[PDB]
Write a protein that binds this ligand. Structure first.
Ligand SMILES: *[C@@H]1O[C@H](CO)[C@@H](O[C@@H]2O[C@H](CO)[C@@H](O)[C@H](O)[C@H]2NC(C)=O)[C@H](O)[C@H]1NC(C)=O
Ligand SMILES: *[C@@H]1O[C@H](CO)[C@@H](O[C@@H]2O[C@H](CO)[C@@H](O)[C@H](O)[C@H]2NC(C)=O)[C@H](O)[C@H]1NC(C)=O
Ligand code: NAG
Ligand code: NAG
Ligand code: NAG
Lengths: 132, 107, 495, 72, 72, 49, 99, 50, 132, 107, 72
């Protein structure tokens, strides 16, 4: 069905880097964008960034300047987020969903909306804990 | 930026009540707003897209309205499975910003 | 040695006049000298140190503003005053805006206005000067003839590190045995200080001449600040916005460190952290060499059975080095080195190691020498003819003369009439050439200078065309002389 | 500012490369070529002026290359 | 660098003063006058070249003021 | 006896991971984060949008 | 109202990790593994080499240098379309009303 | 010049001047081929995706 | 004294990458090259590669084509070896000796001889085990 | 590429014996050879550099000789602390290759 | 590509046959003859141009054989 599956929870060291997967099912994998959103437990939600599956452009917010990398595998229909320079503030739950798609590439807002940010297709959640 | 203020921060009501939420934006976001529920530690669900439209599969007790900067979310009859943290969210101009959140408690 | 592969190296022949040879040496290159005896010395220049500078100027590069007062009187009665215009620490400007009953005053005119701002300074240019004393040149003079560990390695104690200052003199230096060498420097004919300004930014320094540095914008301040912050400028820095009619405002112009660097392009840079460590610039020695043995004549032609432990190793037009390892019972002797031609012996090369010598036992002694421009047999053994080596210096005679002419053109370039002093023992012709080029380059001194690469080559081609227009055989001292000196100067400058 | 008077033909040279190491010369030439490439109409105007005043060919070429170089 | 190409005749004007408010023009004129005052020999050389090539008086004055302005 | 290796020319090559990107009509010239490696080969062009 | 960001120019920069390398006199032109990132700035040059330097053959051998490029505050240049923009005009009448 | 099995003796200026991407002798963990306009070619049809 | 110190033994996953440090003491850190040598337990020694501290050029053997990376820190006088694409054959003891130095760069051989390969200054040894 | 054969692979001798090792190279390595001991699971030590020279701090019972391709390592008097694995090593041409090894056993 | 610059007159010969052993020369001649045989109209055009420009007979023959050989 309309479904995404994430990876299991991970614990990493401060200053390391972590990689979270996001596998898709139920549709044509290049018909939607993938977007990554964090949530600290003592906080609400917070947007991390954006990847397009078709082609592979990315972007991210200013709070993650140079700390985040997004790749994919079109054959497995999977999106990889890699967060670098981990500190204790990065301990959070991570999320990834689907945007309605300006056909070619990312970040559009004028085609009538994205349509969710991010709770229709999204998955089950990846807890990431930065500790010693 | 686009600071999005969500009000109030937490509410308590009894079963069957009508509850309204208000979100205010510092900029014009004319229709680009979304409303979400979040059950705690669970997999959450969209409620309202375009600040006026139901998602298919969402029951009809939810509604939303507002155009300029002030937006009103409304549950007509509060039900015991609707205890969740509710978020409003801008879509415009893309430093994409969420509301703070609104927790519910059943009386 | 300490001088191989550091190319643009200054070979010097001749010692005549008794012993004095005139050498001009600089930080970039080094000088190798030769004579019919008195073995070959190597003159490498290392760091200059100007010990005691004195601070003449502070330029502010970044500034900030505060307390921002402003005032306006009335339409044409009164020109405005403000009590914090009293300090010169504040920057102030009059302007004229407009005033009316909307503004409140009356009479509906274009009334004057002032604005004021306190001036605080960030990191600065700390420009200093040095007198033509309190400065020393350090010269390492090092001899040839053996001692492995490296025909390079200027680090290391084989050549003496002799200092010289203009408060000093004939510069007596001692070496192992033979090397009593007297050097008479003339440091006052060097960079010509009292026209120099060392210029220190946050980490770096530059050497720029004085009139430019005084003439530069980016506010003035003299050396006696400490309290003051009395910057007598600021029309070049902080700029005042005035929109169409109403209130005017202050604007910091920002850091000009990049614009500063773009200004001091075309100027030599210098590390200055520990007092001073001054670099690139030249000086002029006169060299006296009596006082010199050949590290013993006092020996024998050796027995035989040498052994190479190093390659053929050609450096830089002819200078080829060979490191041999003596095997046997030497009791240190000489090395029978020769550069021969083929059979029916016509021995023609030169050895620049003169009287090479083995040390105590097995130690890989090394020898440099110059073959002719073609085939050559470099031979070192004697009694069973022990060892020949074939070598082919590709070269030419005409190409060697043309490259020497290019070296002489580069000496007619960057280094001035000191390069007329770069030879020696010239008597009439060298001295009259130095005086003639002295007055000639003085006429082409300031005196048509200050121009860049492009404009110099353009003024060269226009003056060579107006010389080509050929009136009354002024075309020579015009066209050919001026075109040669302008083109061969313009394509070589801005290095 | 100190954007200009870029300490060029002052003298004071040495054997070693000074600050920008033959990059300022190509900087100057490439920026004036770029400015000619962006504004062709002034180049055409300078060519017309060179053809009108002067009128001996060498004078024409001289003042044309000068009016290409008169830009600040 | 961005020391030059100082966004001058691009267009885009308005009623109001733009950035330096008629200070850049006097900046340009005063620095070229200062550079002429520091280096008189090149001015004399330019005057001699103006007298030699051209030789009609207007052409002389034109190329003289140009060779004063050819400095970077 | 003793040579020293001066150069490697590739004769056959293969490609992978094949990323592409385009911004917008005349706002933006496109960027891509995997242009940072010189191991990737990259080219700008203009298409239509 | 709605601009779109087209370009970033760096104004101040700093350098770190500062690697450099040289081959040998005319065998080899030098390579360095941190030339792989375009984040590093790199340049080839030619210096000199001899046994003093240690190598051999006494030539003018090539050399590289490399530096990591980190950026300070920037120019954040933006463009706007000929929509998403409003002019505000106050039109006001005469005839009285002091203040 | 060594190919898969054979070798050839060619002079130096030609061999430096030849296309088919450059790489210097200090690769090992490099793969830093500073060329590739001579090799891999990019199709662009009439308007769309290249 | 004349001394080098390596890092402790590590165990990593197949396909991962491992980083081994080599800290120096007793001399001027840019007066010698650093060289890395492996040893499988059921095998003798095997040379991995070469780094120069002064400047930082590297090279390696053909058996490690594109799998190995060498960096340094001049301030701490330390050399880092990073082996990528780990497999079960990489389980070995790692070594970092020093060489007599052609002043400027690389693994020269004509200046007499390196002089050890690698047991005068070398250290205490880094055991690396690739396992699941 | 340049191979290096070490012979023999293992030896046993009594205390005080004279033992010799032979290493053969497929190329000319004229003096570039080194001899090392290795105590098992320990920190090992250089014995011979340049195939003829002792290191200072090594006792005088060790020696080495040979020029062209065949090289001989020699312990004059075998001592009980000299049980180790001994290696010969080329330095030339730089795909730097070790010998296989030579283990010792005390009788 | 390396389709051309086919290392021809570089020097470096020896007594022995080098790589293609007198097959590349006949390769070159046969392919240019084949290309002339396929496209006669360009040959006629080259002949007309040879008859028009030049007009001394040797010059005609020279530029005709050249314009047959100008094909890549
Ligand atoms: C450059 O000179 C120095 C000083 O002579 C050399 O350092 C010496 O090297 C020998 C080699 O066996 C040592 O015995 C000395 O103890 C060293 N002197 C010291 C450490 O002060 C250096 O080797 C030379 N450079 C080269 C490349 O040979
Ligand atoms: C410009 O208009 C404002 C707004 O009307 C004026 O402020 C008023 O001034 C009158 C004077 O008696 C007061 O009674 C009002 O209460 C003020 N309005 C406020 C405070 O909102 C202002 O005075 C006018 N400007 C001038 C120079 O008169
Ligand atoms: C100016 O501002 C400073 C703040 O640092 C403070 O001393 C005071 O507010 C002002 N000083 C004056 C007006 O002398
Ligand atoms: C390229 O794609 C493959 C699978 O599609 C993936 O394993 C690999 O990591 C990708 N390369 C990069 C550099 O991400
Ligand atoms: C740069 O140097 C710092 C130490 O100053 C080090 O921590 C960092 O890993 C280095 N970065 C790279 C890419 O080598």
């Amino acid at each position: 069905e309309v479904q995404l599956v994430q990876s299991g929870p991970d614990v990493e060291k401060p200053g390391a880097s972590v990689k979270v997967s996001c596998k898709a099912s139920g549709y044509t994998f290049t018909s939607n964008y993938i977007h990554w959103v964090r949530q600290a437990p003592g906080q609400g939600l917070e947007w991390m960034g954006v990847i397009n599956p078709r082609g592979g452009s990315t972007a991210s917010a200013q709070k993650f300047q140079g700390r985040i990398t997004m790749t994919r595998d079109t054959s497995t229909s999977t999106v990889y987020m890699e967060l670098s320079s981990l500190r204790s503030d990065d301990t959070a739950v991570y999320y990834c969903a689907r945007g309605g798609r300006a056909l070619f590439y990312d970040s559009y807002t004028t085609p009538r909306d994205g349509g969710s940010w991010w709770f229709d297709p999204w998955g089950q959640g990846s807890l990431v804990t930065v500790s010693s | 930026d686009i600071q999005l203020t969500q009000s109030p921060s937490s509410l308590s009501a009894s079963v069957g009540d009508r509850v309204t939420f208000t979100c205010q934006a510092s900029q014009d976001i004319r229709k680009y707003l979304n409303w979400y529920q979040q059950k705690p530690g669970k997999a959450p669900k969209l409620l309202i897209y375009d600040a006026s439209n139901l998602k298919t599969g969402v029951p009809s007790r939810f509604s939303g309205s507002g155009s300029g900067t002030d937006f009103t979310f409304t549950i007509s009859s509060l039900q015991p499975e609707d205890v969740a943290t509710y978020y409003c969210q801008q879509f415009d101009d893309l430093p994409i910003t969420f509301g703070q959140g609104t927790r519910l408690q059943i009386k | 040695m300490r001088c191989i592969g550091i190319s643009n190296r200054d070979f010097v022949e001749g010692v005549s006049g008794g012993s004095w040879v005139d050498i001009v040496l600089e930080h970039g290159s080094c000088v190798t000298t030769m004579a019919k005896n008195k073995p070959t010395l190597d003159f490498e220049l290392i760091k200059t140190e100007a010990k005691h500078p004195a601070t003449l100027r502070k330029y502010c590069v970044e500034a900030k503003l505060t307390n921002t007062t402003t005032a306006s009187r009335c339409p044409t009665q009164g020109e405005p005053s403000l009590n914090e215009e009293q300090d010169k620490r504040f920057v102030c400007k009059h302007s004229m805006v407009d005033r009316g009953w909307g503004n409140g005053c009356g009479l509906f005119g274009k009334g004057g206005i002032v604005t004021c701002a306190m001036f605080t300074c960030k990191k600065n240019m700390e420009g200093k000067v040095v007198q033509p004393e309190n400065l020393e040149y350090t010269i390492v003079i090092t001899p040839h003839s053996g001692e492995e560990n490296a025909v390079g390695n200027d680090t290391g104690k084989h050549g003496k590190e002799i200092k010289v200052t203009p408060q000093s003199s004939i510069t007596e230096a001692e070496l192992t045995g033979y090397g009593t060498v007297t050097m008479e420097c003339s440091p006052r004919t060097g960079l010509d200080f009292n026209e120099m300004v060392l210029l220190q930014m946050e980490n770096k320094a530059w050497l720029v001449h004085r009139q430019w540095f005084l003439d530069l914008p980016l506010p003035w301040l003299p050396g006696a600040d400490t309290q003051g912050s009395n910057w007598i400028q600021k029309e070049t820095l902080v700029t005042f916005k005035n929109p169409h009619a109403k209130k005017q405002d202050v604007v910091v112009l920002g850091s000009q460190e990049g614009a500063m660097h773009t200004a001091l392009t075309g100027a030599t840079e210098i590390q200055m952290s520990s007092g001073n460590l001054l670099f690139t610039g030249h000086l002029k020695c006169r060299l006296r060499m009596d006082k010199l043995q050949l590290k013993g004549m006092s020996y024998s032609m050796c027995t035989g059975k040498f052994k190479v432990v190093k390659e053929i190793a050609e450096t830089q037009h002819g200078t080829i080095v060979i490191r041999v390892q003596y095997e046997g019972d030497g009791s240190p002797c000489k090395i029978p080195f020769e550069i021969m031609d083929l059979e029916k012996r016509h021995v023609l090369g030169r050895l620049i190691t003169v009287n090479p010598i083995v040390t105590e036992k097995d130690s890989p002694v090394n020898i440099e020498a110059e073959p002719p421009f073609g085939d050559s047999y470099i031979i070192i053994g004697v009694e069973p003819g022990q060892l020949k080596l074939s070598w082919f210096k590709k070269g030419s005679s005409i190409g060697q003369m043309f490259e020497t002419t290019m070296r002489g053109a580069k000496r007619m370039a960057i280094l001035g009439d000191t390069a007329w002093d770069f030879g020696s023992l010239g008597g009439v012709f060298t001295s009259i050439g130095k005086a003639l080029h002295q007055v000639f380059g003085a006429i082409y001194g300031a005196a048509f200078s200050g121009v860049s690469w492009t404009m110099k080559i353009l003024i060269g081609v226009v003056i060579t065309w107006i010389g080509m227009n050929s009136r009354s055989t002024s075309l020579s001292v015009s066209l050919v002389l001026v075109g040669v000196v302008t083109l061969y100067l313009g394509v070589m400058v801005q290095a | 500012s100190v954007a200009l008077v870029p300490h060029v033909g002052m003298g004071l040279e040495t054997r070693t490369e000074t600050w920008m190491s033959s990059e300022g010369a190509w900087k100057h030439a490439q920026r004036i070529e770029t400015w000619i490439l962006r504004h062709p109409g002034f180049t055409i105007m300078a060519a017309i002026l060179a053809y009108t005043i002067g009128t001996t060919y060498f004078q024409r070429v001289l003042i044309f290359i000068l009016l290409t170089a008169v830009t600040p």
